[PDB]
Amino acid sequence: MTTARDIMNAGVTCVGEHETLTAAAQYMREHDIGALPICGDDDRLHGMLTDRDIVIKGLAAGLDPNTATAGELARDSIYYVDANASIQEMLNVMEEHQVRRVPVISEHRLVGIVTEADIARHL
Amino acid sequence: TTARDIMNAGVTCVGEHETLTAAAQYMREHDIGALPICGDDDRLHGMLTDRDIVIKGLAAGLDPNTATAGELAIYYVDANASIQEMLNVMEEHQVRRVPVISEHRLVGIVTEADIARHLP
Ligand SMILES: [Zn+2]
Ligand SMILES: [Zn+2]
C-alpha cells in the first residue's frame, strides 16, 4: 500500500515559530517558495504559513510584520497526515482544508510535505 | 462572447498612491489575490498580487504603511476581446487575472475561472 512517506518530499526545512513575518517573507523570496511549514523546537509542527496569509492575516489584520510571528499566524492553519496515511486520506485532508499541499508527520515531528502533484505521480 | 460579457465590472482598483497595507485590506475584503492599480480617472497602471506585496514589498525591506501600490506596479484586453485573445494575454504573462479596458479606462477584471464558468 502506498503511503504519504512513499510520496512525500522528505526532509524539508521547517521555519521557526518565532520568526517574524518579515523574516518569513525574506525566506519565501530567498527560497522561491510560497507555503512554509512552521515548527516549535525539534520540528514540532504548529501549522502552515503562506505568502497570502502574511498579507491577509497579517497586514490586512493590522499586525506589524516586524513583531508578529510566523507561529502566531500558522496556528490558524493546522492540518497534516501521518506518514502512514493513504492517498485517499491525503486527498480527504486536502479537500477539507481546501489546500493542495499537506505536511506529513511521524511521532509528532514533521518529516515531509506532500502535494497533489506528488500524489498524481504516484497513482 | 467578449471580455465585457464575462468580466466582473466595476471592481475595486487600488489607487497608485494607496499603501500596500491598503491594498492588503482590499485583498482581504474582496477575498482576491490580485488588484488592478489605477492613476486618475480609472486609467490602468498595472496589477498588484498578494505575493508581490510579500516579495517586492516586505522581503525588499519596504514599509507596507509607506510604500505605495504604484511603486510596485502592464497587460490587459479591450472590452471587446474574444476568449482566444484573453487566453493569449494570460498565457503570455503567465497570469489567471486580466484587467479589461474600454475608452482608456478600467471597466472590469476577467479571471481564467470566469471564462471557464461562462462557457456553455
Ligand atoms: Zn457573468
Ligand atoms: Zn504583454
In this structure, how many other beta carbons lie within 10 angstroms of the beta carbon of residue B74?
10
**Grid cell digits, residue A108:** 509528532
Resolution for this experimental structure (Å): 1.9
**Contact yes or no for A54/A25 (Cβ under 8 A):** yes
Q: Do A29 and B53 touch (CB under 8 A)?
A: no
3 state DSSP class of A118: helix
**Contact yes or no for A29/B55 (Cβ under 8 A):** yes
Interval between CA B2 and ligand 1 midpoint (Å): 11
Identify the bridge partners of residue A110 per DSSP, sorted by sequence position. A105
**Grid cell digits, residue A13:** 526545512
Sequence-distant (6+) residues with CB within 8 A of A96 are A79
**Contact yes or no for B26/B89 (Cβ under 8 A):** no
User: How far apart, in whole angstroms, are the C-alpha atoms of residue A121 and residue A117?
Assistant: 6
Domains delineated in chain B: 1-120 (3.10.580.10)
Which of A26, A59, A61 shows the shortest C-beta gap to B59? A26
In this structure, how many other beta carbons lie within 10 angstroms of the beta carbon of residue A22?
21
Best of B26, B54, B56, B65 to substitute, by most chain A Cβ atoms within 10 angstroms, is: B54
**Binding-site entries of B for Zn(2+):** 93, 118
CA A64 to chain centre: 22
B108 φ/ψ angles, rounded to the nearest 5 degrees? 175, -175
In this structure, how many other beta carbons lie within 10 angstroms of the beta carbon of residue B115?
19
DSSP string for A53-106: HIIIIIGGGT--TTTSBHHHHHTTS---EETT--HHHHHHHHHHHT-SEEEEEE
Per CB-CB distance under 8 Å, the chain A contacts of B20 are: 59
In this structure, how many other beta carbons lie within 10 angstroms of the beta carbon of residue B51?
21
CA B120 to chain centre: 26
Sequence-distant (6+) residues with CB within 8 A of A107 are none
CA A73 to chain centre: 12
Q: What is the 3-state secondary structure (H, E, C) of chain B?
A: CCHHHHCEECCCCEECCCEHHHHHHHHHHCCCCEEEEECHHHCEEEEEEHHHHHHHHHHHCCCCCCCEHHHHCCCCEECCCCHHHHHHHHHHHCCCEEEEEECCEEEEEEEHHHHHHHCC
Best of B58, B65, B66 to substitute, by most chain A Cβ atoms within 10 angstroms, is: B58
Q: Do A25 and B54 touch (CB under 8 A)?
A: yes
